[PDB]
UniProtKB/Swiss-Prot annotation:
BP GO annotations: DNA double-strand break processing; DNA repair; double-strand break repair; double-strand break repair via homologous recombination; double-strand break repair via nonhomologous end joining; mitotic G2 DNA damage checkpoint signaling; mitotic intra-S DNA damage checkpoint signaling; telomere maintenance
Record keywords: Chromosome, DNA damage, DNA repair, Nucleus, Phosphoprotein, Telomere
Domain FHA: residue ranges: 23-86
Residues of the full protein shown: 1 to 320 of 613
Lineage of origin: Eukaryota, Fungi, Dikarya, Ascomycota, Taphrinomycotina
This protein's record includes keyword Phosphoprotein: yes
Compartmental location: Nucleus; Chromosome; Chromosome, Telomere
Family from the record: Belongs to the Nibrin family.
Name of this protein: DNA repair and telomere maintenance protein nbs1
Function: Component of the MRN complex, which plays a central role in double-strand break (DSB) repair, DNA recombination, maintenance of telomere integrity and meiosis. The MRN complex is involved in the repair of DNA double-strand breaks (DSBs) via homologous recombination (HR), an error-free mechanism which primarily occurs during S and G2 phases. The complex (1) mediates the end resection of damaged DNA, which generates proper single-stranded DNA, a key initial steps in HR, and is (2) required for the recruitment of other repair factors and efficient activation of tel1/atm upon DNA damage.
Species annotation: Schizosaccharomyces pombe (strain 972 / ATCC 24843)
Amino acid sequence: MWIIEAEGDILKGKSRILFPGTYIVGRNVSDDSSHIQVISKSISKRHARFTILTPSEKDYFTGGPCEFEVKDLDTKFGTKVNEKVVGQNGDSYKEKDLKIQLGKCPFTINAYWRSMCIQFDNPEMLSQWASNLNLLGIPTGLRDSDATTHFVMNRQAGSSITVGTMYAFLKKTVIIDDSYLQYLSTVKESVIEDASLMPDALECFKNIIKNNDQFPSSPEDCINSLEGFSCAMLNTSSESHHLLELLGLRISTFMSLGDIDKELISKTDFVVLNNAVYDSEKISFPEGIFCLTIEQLWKIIIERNSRELISKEIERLKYA
């Protein structure tokens, strides 16, 4: 998100968030979804137009800013950006920091890019929200990215949280939901006028965690909680692999149930099965070894005594 701020009283001490759109900047305009009043003599009545474009697809992966275009409005003294006079056709920038000088005014409008990239749990939710957040200058996606700041969880409020939400939680990603994204649109206009009114994502995250038996006490208490243990897993979900790695598990992967050898059982403490191969399998289960789903493993992780609870179950099965 583009934020603008200025020294002195020229933006009345308020930072502004410039969502994609176009803004006329001068001394004789009124603060609007499309106008920015700058409080200065020696800037023109209508001095400059700032135009913010919607994000590129790349921006979700790069953390790169929306294109910011500056045009001088035929003013007496012109407009500079980062010391460079703006040409008659305007200029556009993808730097993360802009110093904008309007005419003879020595107090510059400073624009800076504040990172916000939102990952979605599933394609359905992304499809609901993508256009809306594009228009807010917030890049969105499903794939993993190093630029991600927030993860939107599926709040089905009727079943276990997804492997994507578990993994985001252990990554120390701020988790948000439906209501935060809706609140964002609701207060859009006041955020343009005062950046400090931007809804706090941490607060939504906190509200989600609190009194929720789907989330452990802390992400930190889960990390390396199961180191020493090894497990075998099927060929699906790399998030599932990454998550079990953050728990400290050494992972083996296997294609078929008939690929559980005497060798594999010997090197494996327990087996992690997919939901389909867990629900329907009867005769083909490996006799000696503990088998469970990610959902079930997560519930053990939620408990205070995860290590023993798993060990107590390893021994429990070792006899039969």
